[PDB]
Design a protein around this ligand. Sequence first.
Ligand SMILES: O=C1N=NC(=O)c2cc(OCC3CCC3)ccc21
Lengths: 197, 194
Amino acid sequence: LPEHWTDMNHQLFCMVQLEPGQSEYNTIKDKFTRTCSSYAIEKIERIQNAFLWQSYQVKKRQMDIKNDHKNNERLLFHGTDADSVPYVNQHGFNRSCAGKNAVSYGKGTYFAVDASYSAKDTYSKPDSNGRKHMYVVRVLTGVFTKGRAGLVTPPPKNPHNPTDLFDSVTNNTRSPKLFVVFFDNQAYPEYLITFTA
Amino acid sequence: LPEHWTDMNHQLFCMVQLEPGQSEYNTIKDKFTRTCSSYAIEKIERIQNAFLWQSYQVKKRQMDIKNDHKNNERLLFHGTDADSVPYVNQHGFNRSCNAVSYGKGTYFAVDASYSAKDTYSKPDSNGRKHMYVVRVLTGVFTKGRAGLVTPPPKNPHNPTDLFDSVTNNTRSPKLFVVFFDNQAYPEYLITFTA
Ligand SMILES: O=C1N=NC(=O)c2cc(OCC3CCC3)ccc21
């Protein structure tokens, strides 16, 4: 488990509230405000989930071996409804629970490059107290191609070798604005931003 | 990587045809012929997929901690069509890919006879049928129902603490459904005919 995490005392899960003025808080706030300057952050919590971390780090090591000298990991945003937050915190991102996206590049979990995309009410639905929720997520994007609405897994790199797959898909390979992942433990929810208008 | 695997010359995936009449082949043949003795076995292959095995062993250690006991694993059967065999060998079982009466997961049978039905182990253009022997993390289980995307909670007072799998019948189970990647490791592939 990462050495800067708070001691959990044999606990496998906890949320840690970050302090404004710490570099850890301030970098997430800057990443968010770059495209969401009109919203205000209530708090940022570090997600310490031992089991999700273990499974994710195993998948990362495998993709680092398979792809050899690629930047396989991106830090991306995911807006969700309050009713989903307890499940994501404990179990991560389940494609079986994902909605149809307004522009579908496949049936998977969607992650945004820009916080502004995730900040739409359609993804970060305001709760009964006007709080919006967005995860900051380590995503194994690996080698990616433009997706298509029919995909249930990423497409093959070569049609004559149907099982050798891209790691993820995007809307545009030249200027990616979203990524779609189709497998469990390909994304680690690292921070939860609670924010308001 | 388990003792009974044979050397892979620094590769991460291999299918190894078992030798008839040796202990390993005999163990797997007997599990199948318990209910499928009228079939003809052409071959049994051991699936050596390092990455699937790693991801499965991690989930096993996690389930052994969560459940506070070490009896979470069952050996079950899965019939599939010939065109799905390369995908399962390389990537394992994928719920996103027949009836799903007990939930939208991957189905495993207690009896080879159930998986030997032509609707599951679809005969290819040469009459050959395919069935996996699968290590499955069934863990603590409950009765499934149509439309589940995950197992139910163990107590709806804590809705995120889930059963590990569902079944048709808790007292005398004949099939199990799992809803997560890397809860099932395909260990052997049986090629057989009617
Ligand atoms: O071996 C199988 N391979 N693929 C399946 O979809 C499958 C499904 C299965 O029960 C599905 C429903 C009938 C009552 C529940 C049993 C076995 C298999």
